[model samples]
Every structure is written in C-alpha cells, then in structure tokens.
Target: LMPGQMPPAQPLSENPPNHILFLTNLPEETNELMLSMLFNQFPGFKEVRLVPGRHDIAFVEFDNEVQAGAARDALQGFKITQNNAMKISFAKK
Candidate 1:
C-alpha cells in the first residue's frame, strides 16, 4: 500500500430518518425473509421489504413513534454482519 494513498471520504447526505429505513448496498441474494428476520427483531417494527435492485435496498416501517423510537435506540449503530453495518431509522409520517 502506498504510504501517501488517501482513503475515500464518507458520503455526505442528510439523514432525515423516518420509521422507514432506506437500506442500500446489500447482497443481491438477501431477500425479504432475511430482512424480516433482521428488522422484526427491532422494536416496534411492523414490516421489512426489499426493493428490487441490482444490489439491494429496503424499507422498514414501525407502528408508531414509541415503537420507532425503540427501534432507533436498539438498531442505530447495529452491525448486520462482520462487514456490514445496518442503517436504522424511524419513518416520518
């Protein structure tokens, strides 16, 4: 590795998280079963969905703000796997 090589910077975007989690960069093989398995474990999460894409993207909805709050508390900064970190948030109504 070059000593002077620079690492790519983190992308800058607004995270106006609602109960809906705009998941990105997921394994193509991952499906609703996996998403359900993952998000259902979160607090107040009612459903998990995978939007069709070459990679993967999903949305999770919570029943209410209390549940959404709970989900955020437990899901934020969660690691889905060794190399993947889950991006969790509340859905804005």
Candidate 2:
C-alpha cells in the first residue's frame, strides 16, 4: 500500500467481534429511552449508557456480535437531529 492508500474493507467476523458499540455525535436532546427505541429495532439489544456529563456520546451493548454489527451498519451516519449525525464504532475492550 502507498502512503495515501487505505486497507481493504473486511468483515466484522474477521476478528473477535464486539457486542458493545461506542456512539458519538449524538444530539443534545438524546436520552436513554430514545436510544433504546432506536437500537431495540435490531435483535439482542442489551442496553445504552450515556456518558456522564457528556450528552454527545454513549455506549450501546448487544447480546451478540452479529446484532451489534448489524445495528452499527444500520445506524451509522444516520441523522439524530437536523444537524447531528450518529457515528458508530466498536467499543474498545
């Protein structure tokens, strides 16, 4: 790969997948129930925890890695508000 080149996209299963996902760029009005409603549409949703004192970030955990991956794909880059778009990534172990 060259300096500006990026690695190829790989399936989440390539690694030991994560069931917990980190969410950022949340709208200020976001709350636990709202998050729960959004993520609960997918399977195996466990919980969503908003970062203390940080309304723009949260963590969502799922019962399985596959569900987590699906949720991330379905919600990533989705708009939470007129100007806020959700960002999803695997939670750091």
Candidate 3:
C-alpha cells in the first residue's frame, strides 16, 4: 500500500418536527449544493449543513417545524444517486 491513501467510510423521534431536519444515508456526493437544491424545493427552506467528513448524513433547516415536515416527507424516498436513498428524521436536542 502507498504511504498516503484515502479511506472510504437516526433518531428515535422518526419525525423531527423542528426547524432543522436530520438526513441520513444521503450519498457519496454529500455536498451542501446538492442537499440545498433538494430541500429548497419545499417552503421556507433555510440551509443545508453537511456534517464534517461524513458522506451519509446532512442537516436541513427550514423556516419552521411544519415546513420542515414537508421537506422531510417529500424527500424521504429520494435517491441521491439511484442507489442511495435518503433517511429523514428530526434532530435530537
């Protein structure tokens, strides 16, 4: 093996009903732009925060709880790359 190499590597609520939505099993291309584009489709879309060094989780923020729900439900069954489906849930805090 070479000296330098790159290694390859939700919540009980089931529904966050909060301003921020936690997304699981996103995809290998876990970038903010990709996530933002999807979550932005819903009303009151705020921001998409891709967790550091992670490729299967993301944080989606909306204007309110209700709005967040819309994004979650609608995107729950979305496939990021034909193989990776998104898992939506509320953040615990």
Write candidate 1's Cα lDDT for 1-92 as tens digits: 77452322211344344545556545546677787777776545677655554444566666543355456456665465666566654433
How do all the candidates rank in terms of lDDT, highest first? 2, 3, 1
lDDT of 3: 0.69
* TM-score, predicted candidate 2 vs. hidden true structure: 0.72
TM-score of every candidate relative to the true structure = 0.57, 0.72, 0.72
lDDT tens digits, residue span 50-72, model 2: 77888888888765544676677
User: What does candidate 3's lDDT look like per residue over 1-93, in tens digits?
Assistant: 763422111235343245677788877877888777777766678777766879888788776545665566667857878879898877654
Clashing pairs in 1: 18-90, 18-91, 18-92, 19-90, 19-91, 20-91
Off by over 4 Å in 2: 1-17
| TM-score, cand. 1 vs. native | 0.57
lDDT of 3 at 75: 75
Residue 76's lDDT within candidate 3 is 81
Q: By lDDT, who's the top model here?
A: 2
lDDT scores for all predictions? 0.55, 0.73, 0.69
Question: Which residues of candidate 1, in runs, are more than 4 Å off?
Answer: 1-19, 54-56, 90-93
